[PDB]
Amino acid sequence: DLELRVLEESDLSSHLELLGHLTEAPPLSGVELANIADMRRRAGIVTKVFCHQPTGRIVGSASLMIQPKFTRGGRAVGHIEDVVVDPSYRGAGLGKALIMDLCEISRSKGCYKVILDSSEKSLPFYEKLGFRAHERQMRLDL
Amino acid sequence: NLYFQGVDLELRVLEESDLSSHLELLGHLTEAPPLSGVELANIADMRRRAGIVTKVFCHQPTGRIVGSASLMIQPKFTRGGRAVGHIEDVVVDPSYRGAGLGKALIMDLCEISRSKGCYKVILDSSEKSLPFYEKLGFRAHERQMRLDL
């Protein structure tokens, strides 16, 4: 019933909605939604989504940012974020599927590591993948 | 402009003629094998197009880069499109350490993130670097996971 694929302009609406589960997601216009999408492309971000084909509802999303460093001979690092699954599709293997895919995209670009930040509950899920705990995420609110 | 100690230092944006001394500084963080000016420039353009800002302490009279920190300013669909800042690769030269240069770098990039409308700045800290970041307003939240390869 579902299709994994890169985010497209016509998803932006439903996708903004699915993210409403991560944090507040007030409306943006077609113009604003496409510019943000442009800056995210310019920034080396791929958003992979699960789309339920009949309704077109985005039921899954995860983003990869890949960026070159000057270190390790110029080799890239992949950073995963904003993994979100519809409350109706939780327990269904979508989250795992998204991560797997982005790690493969990381591999095919020659990244030497994929990093993400995890809550206390998502830990065991990530470790089965097998990501391993290291540093501590620090946050400053501005 | 917030005061930092050192009459001979300047806090400024990374430049093309810095790239080689800068890679050398970054060898205090991890392996930094050498790269040609062409590779350096390529990587520097790519990071710049991606919206990364690198701020640098330069020892003016040698040209030596003695402090670096990087900010990715990262656009989002949520919160009306308000960006998230990510700091990475903070490093100061061992000879310039304990003079508050790493504090001045972080503070500077936090201010830059505010100018660009960011609602937060995240980074990842090792166990030792924890109190340092605490003192700069950062509070411990999630755990970094790493997948090798």
How many Cβ pairs closer than 8 A exist between chain A and B?
Answer: 188
Q: Which residues of A touch B49 (CB under 8 A)?
A: 42
CB B84 within 8 A of CB B76: yes
Q: What are the residues facing B108 on neighbouring strands?
A: none
CB B146 to CB A114 under 8 A? yes
Domains annotated on chain A, with CATH: 1-142 (3.40.630.30)
HSE-CB for A44 with a 13 A CA cutoff: 22
| Residue in the structure block whose two tokens are 């946050």 | A139
Technique used: X-ray
Cβ neighbours of B33 in A, within 8 Å: 72-73
Cα pseudo-dihedral B106, B111, B117, B119, rounded to 10: 50
Dist CA A141 CA B149 (whole Å): 32
Q: What's the CA gap between B146 and B149, in Å, rounded?
A: 9
Check if the beta carbon of residue A52 is closer than 8 Å to that of residue A1.
Answer: yes
Tokens matching residue A74: 């110029």
Rg (CA), chain A: 16
Angle between helices B37-49 and B19-26 (to 10 degrees): 80
Q: Which residues of A touch B139 (CB under 8 A)?
A: 138-140
Tell me, in Å, the resolution of the deposited structure.
2.3
Whose CA is closest to B27, among A66, A108, A69?
A: A69
Q: Between vectors from CA B55 to CA A37 and to CA A38, what angle results, nearest 5°?
A: 10
Chain A neighbours among B 23-42 (CB < 8 Å)? 23, 26-27, 29-33, 35, 39-40
Query: Mind giving me the DSSP string for A20-84?
Result: TTTS------HHHHHHHHHHHHHTTEEEEEEEETTTTEEEEEEEEEEEE-SSGGG-EEEEEEEEE
The answer to whether the Cβ–Cβ distance between B145 and A127 falls below 8 Å is yes
Question: Which residues numbered 47-66 in B keep a CB inside 8 Å of some CB on A?
Answer: 47, 49-52
B113–A contact, CB cutoff 8 A: yes
Question: Is A118 in a helix, a strand, or coil?
Answer: strand
> Where do we find the tokens 């308000």?
B82
Helix axes A12-19, A30-42, angle to 10 degrees: 80
Smallest Cβ distance to B79: which of A24, A43, A123? A24
Distance CA A91, CA A100 (A): 16
CA–CA–CA angle A46, A47, A48 (5° rounding): 115
